[PDB]
Ligand SMILES: *[C@@H]1O[C@H](CO)[C@@H](O[C@@H]2O[C@H](CO)[C@@H](O[C@@H]3O[C@H](CO[C@H]4O[C@H](CO)[C@@H](O)[C@H](O)[C@@H]4O)[C@@H](O)[C@H](O[C@H]4O[C@H](CO)[C@@H](O)[C@H](O)[C@@H]4O)[C@@H]3O)[C@H](O)[C@H]2NC(C)=O)[C@H](O)[C@H]1NC(C)=O
Ligand SMILES: *[C@@H]1O[C@H](CO)[C@@H](O[C@@H]2O[C@H](CO)[C@@H](O[C@@H]3O[C@H](CO)[C@@H](O)[C@H](O)[C@@H]3O)[C@H](O)[C@H]2NC(C)=O)[C@H](O)[C@H]1NC(C)=O
Ligand SMILES: *[C@@H]1O[C@H](CO)[C@@H](O[C@@H]2O[C@H](CO)[C@@H](O[C@@H]3O[C@H](CO)[C@@H](O)[C@H](O)[C@@H]3O)[C@H](O)[C@H]2NC(C)=O)[C@H](O)[C@H]1NC(C)=O
Ligand SMILES: *[C@@H]1O[C@H](CO)[C@@H](O[C@@H]2O[C@H](CO)[C@@H](O[C@@H]3O[C@H](CO)[C@@H](O)[C@H](O)[C@@H]3O)[C@H](O)[C@H]2NC(C)=O)[C@H](O)[C@H]1NC(C)=O
Ligand SMILES: *[C@@H]1O[C@H](CO)[C@@H](O[C@@H]2O[C@H](CO)[C@@H](O)[C@H](O)[C@H]2NC(C)=O)[C@H](O)[C@H]1NC(C)=O
């Protein structure tokens with residue numbers, strides 16, 4: 015589920031390996047997600063549409079990270095406990111068997127709850143820290 | 151002036167309530183500010199124009215938060231004291247009577263001073279922390 | 287949950303199979319962006335197409351060539367390119383005046399195919415004889431004076447017998463339905479290789495285990511930023527200037543038992559074909575309107591009576607034999623019997639292609655006249671015909687006129703694939719063997735090249751359990 | 767080959783009684799059933815195995831695994847009698863006739 | 868919408884040819900596959916051929932490919948058919964036919980009203 019990252023792979027070369035042997039391309043994956051590629055004709059519209067859609071994708075992802083207190087990092091520990099309804103998952107295969115491309119299917123149908131949980135916990139922590147600073 | 155935040159209101163539903171309650175809806179307004187909505191014709195220009203202006207406004211707001219040391223949070227305590235020229239505002243009415251839509255009319259004619267004071271104090275603190283680290 | 291906490295991860299290797307608009311990357315470089323068009327100078331991007339392939343350890347992905355939307359993207363881009371490029375050029379509407387035509391005349395030329403001088407067009411029957419000499423009143427620039435111009439048209443470009451069967455008066459064929467536009471001479475454009483590059487946030491996957499049937503898993507997967515050079519060539523009954531499979535001949539259909547579904551055959555060794563129109567065409571230039579010029583073939587000087595294509599006999603014979611062997615594997619315990627083209631419009635009843643801006647049509651009965659798993663038990667010559675007025679693709683309503691090209695024209699090509707269909711009802715004991723050549727949408731041509739690729743969007747955010755509670759505690763957990 | 771073979775060719779059925787028809791298939795492929803209203807143009811009934819055509823009540827149903835399909839028409843009304851054909855990519859079965867007693 | 872019009876009936880002599888017409892409406896005639904089915908009385912319906920109106924490509928059932936010719940006209944939305952040499956055994960109804968999606972050759976639509984023709988002597 016974690017390990018020491020690298021950037022020399024260039025792009026998505028892993029993939030395939032387990033999560034503990036695949037969560038290491040985070041730098042390069044973050045890089046390539048936005049960088050590049052770059053008589054009357056209209057394909058300027060197509061190029062602008064593609065560029066704007068990519069930029070909006072990146073901004074939405076960064077905003078979702080920012081709400082949860084995770085902006086400024088790729089890895090991010092959080093406070094939300096594992097759901098009361100799950101308490102069951104196959105962690106023995108999380109650590110060293112399932113690749114991300116497989117694990118992403120098992121968290122589907124439940125991801126929507128996790129974002130709300132993270133948001134609520136972060137806002138509680140925010141107001142708690144503000145109160146703590148305002149205590150004295 | 152502060153409240154335990156929420157996201158279940160969907161959009162701008164409050165409004166109206168005092169600042170101490172209207173300050174709970176920060177997450178949903180932050181979310182909806184950028185997300186969505188999404189033979190030869192030109193309204194692609196209109197759509198691209200709208201998207202680009204929305205993204206530019208969001209980037210300007212985030213940059214202004216970043217300069218003041220507030221990027222990554224919705225609430226943000228700072229160091230700038232209440233202005234020497236003000237020392238008069240109606241705080242009993244701030245906490246539980248005035249809504250944000252009313253209070254925004256009173257901080258007008260003076261906000262431009264705050265947008266300088268905040269960055270001044272932040273840069274002072276930045277160089278102070280750099281010097282403190284350099285001390286060892 | 288005293289040992290169990292979530293964790294956010296970003297930049298994670300996950301993707302899903304969405305669809306998007308791809309970038310056009312040129313050859314790097316042949317584009318003069320406005321001076322002339324070679325394929326897409328006004329529109330497409332010149333940039334480095336270096337694929338930079340990457341292999342993946344244990345990935346297994348499902349590919350489908352028939353549902354590959356990139357062929358639809360190619361279709362739309364090609365149609366838009368041709369439509370916007372032909373738009374500024376001259377209109378042929380003023381040229382629809384009544385044409386009085388007569389048989390051509392030869393000023394003592396010589397014939398290639400026999401050791402004697404030309405005597406009569408009816409016996410010297412090629413180019414001359416199929417081509418009519420027409421004269422017509424046309425307007426000068428000042429709109430008050432008219433003159434007797436003349437030009438020589440191919441017989442398919444003119445239509446009698448709606449001018450009554452005794453008048454010897456001819457129209458242009460297009461005027462019955464639509465008005466044509468001439469191709470701008472500076473715009474003349476040819477099959478430059480093109481590369482497709484994914485936009486930001488999308489990855490183009492490629493399958494290297496070439497021998498998969500076309501719809502199933504592929505294990506030798508690889509990732510590429512820009513596809514290899516695809517040539518936007520268009521031809522019927524035969525793919526040319528294509529790639530080649532590393533294994534021997536390959537055959538592809540979503541259901542071979544579904545007879546109406548086209549069968550694409552992909553070769554491993556190319557068979558060279560040479561096509562030529564001898565004789566020096568003289569480009570006549572006649573004025574229309576204030577500042578428009580119309581090009582037409584004047585007299586044809588030099589030796590005339592040939593319009594041929596040539597294919598090596600034994601090479602094509604063995605290629606067809608290997609096709610027959612593979613189809614015998616797929617269709618067990620029965621022969622394979624190739625046959626003449628089924629019929630239909632001449633754009634698909636004949637092999638079609640363009641060389642040097644001149645459109646060719648060639649009778650292919652010489653080529654598919656086979657028998658059991660091969661031909662029955664030296665160069666094969668294809669008689670051909672030429673048209674100038676063109677319906678752009680199959681049956682789309684956009685017409686075009688091709689200006690003639692002066693001097694003799696010769697082109698070479700590598701045949702790489704075939705397009706076949708099968709006989710229908712049965713008569714079981716005597717039907718499964720039959721196969722014929724068939725036409726093809728340009729989707730069928732471009733599928734043989736965009737076979738390999740798939741488009742997926744990155745989902746760079748993921749969640750998983752880890753050992754950390756934020757600022758508080760650790761974790762007890764499991765292992766494989 | 768002989769891709770389709772329907773049976774029974776002749777069937778006698780009283781009104782309100784359930785009908786049964788079978789179509790073999792010697793090769794893998796789609797299957798279907800057509801209703802020939804007597805002296806009229808036939809019409810689609812079932813296709814792709816068990817899926818019903820548009821506007822057909824639920825009386826018409828069937829199923830298969832591989833080389834044998836059973837068609838059943840519960841409580842056939844008088845109007846739905848006639849001749850029924852089995853089709854697969856080009857072929858037609860010899861047909862099965864149902865008459866009202 | 869789908870609509871398959873057809874010509875009326877007629878009576879023919881042995882060795883002579885017939886022509887038949889079938890006209891489309893309510894959809895794009897160029898892109899959609901079209902079919903023809905013979906339906907003789909009291910025996911197997913027989914396949915006759917296909918037609919793709921875009922390119923005019925055709926394909927024929929083998930026992931009839933020495934006689935059948937199938938054509939179309941895009942600007943009139945009309946399909947046409949012919950038998951180059953008849954016999955009494957050709958007595959049957961002729962049904963021009965589509966598929967409803969017609970990304971699939973099989974049919975899977977009307978079946979327009981048909982047209983009966985008899986060969987007699
Ligand atoms: C399949 O693949 C084959 C190659 O394997 C392609 O073959 C080429 O076809 C093109 C036409 O489609 C040919 O282009 C023409 O070549 C002529 C000869 O070129 C030689 O001689 C000239 C001097 O005469 C030299 O400058 C040149 O470097 C060569 O040594 C040119 O004279 C022609 O010029 C005309 O076109 C150009 C470009 O538009 C204009 O700028 C000119 O002003 C002029 O109008 C023309 O370029 C090419 O020669 C063929 N190559 C070979 C090796 O034979 C097939 O085209 C391709 N597609 C098909 C369908 O077969
Ligand atoms: C394609 O293949 C055909 C057939 O093989 C080639 O035709 C040949 O063309 C040459 C000229 O290019 C002819 O040469 C002449 O032959 C006569 C004798 O017949 C001789 O008296 C002349 O002096 C001259 O040499 C040759 O006859 C002719 N062959 C045949 C069988 O007609 C053709 O050249 C090939 N290439 C192309 C581009 O068509
Ligand atoms: C390709 O070229 C061949 C040979 O030039 C063409 O074959 C000829 O096609 C015509 C028209 O179909 C045939 O005409 C028929 O002839 C029979 C007698 O054999 C007659 O009874 C018919 O009424 C009709 O006139 C001709 O026989 C045939 N000849 C040969 C040698 O095949 C072919 O049509 C060309 N195809 C294309 C697509 O250009
Ligand atoms: C499938 O057909 C091929 C022939 O099409 C049979 O194999 C043998 O193939 C060679 C090479 O093509 C034939 O020799 C060549 O014949 C051509 C005339 O077609 C000639 O132009 C070449 O110069 C060379 O002589 C050879 O004749 C042929 N053998 C026989 C008995 O025809 C193969 O046997 C066939 N498949 C089966 C299962 O029989
Ligand atoms: C095509 O027809 C034109 C017009 O009839 C021919 O041009 C004339 O040819 C005659 C001799 O045949 C000359 O006296 C004239 O001077 C030519 N020009 C005109 C404007 O009349 C032309 O030669 C014919 N070409 C062929 C190949 O038959």
Ligand SMILES: *[C@@H]1O[C@H](CO)[C@@H](O)[C@H](O)[C@H]1NC(C)=O
Nearest residue numbers: 391392393394395403404405
């Ligand atoms: C061609 O040459 C022959 C023989 O020399 C001659 O009779 C004829 O007039 C010449 N011109 C034409 C157009 O045939």
Ligand SMILES: *[C@@H]1O[C@H](CO)[C@@H](O)[C@H](O)[C@H]1NC(C)=O
Nearest residue numbers: 651652653655656657662663
């Ligand atoms: C077709 O092949 C047969 C083989 O028996 C041959 O007799 C015939 O002449 C060929 N016809 C053509 C036009 O190639």
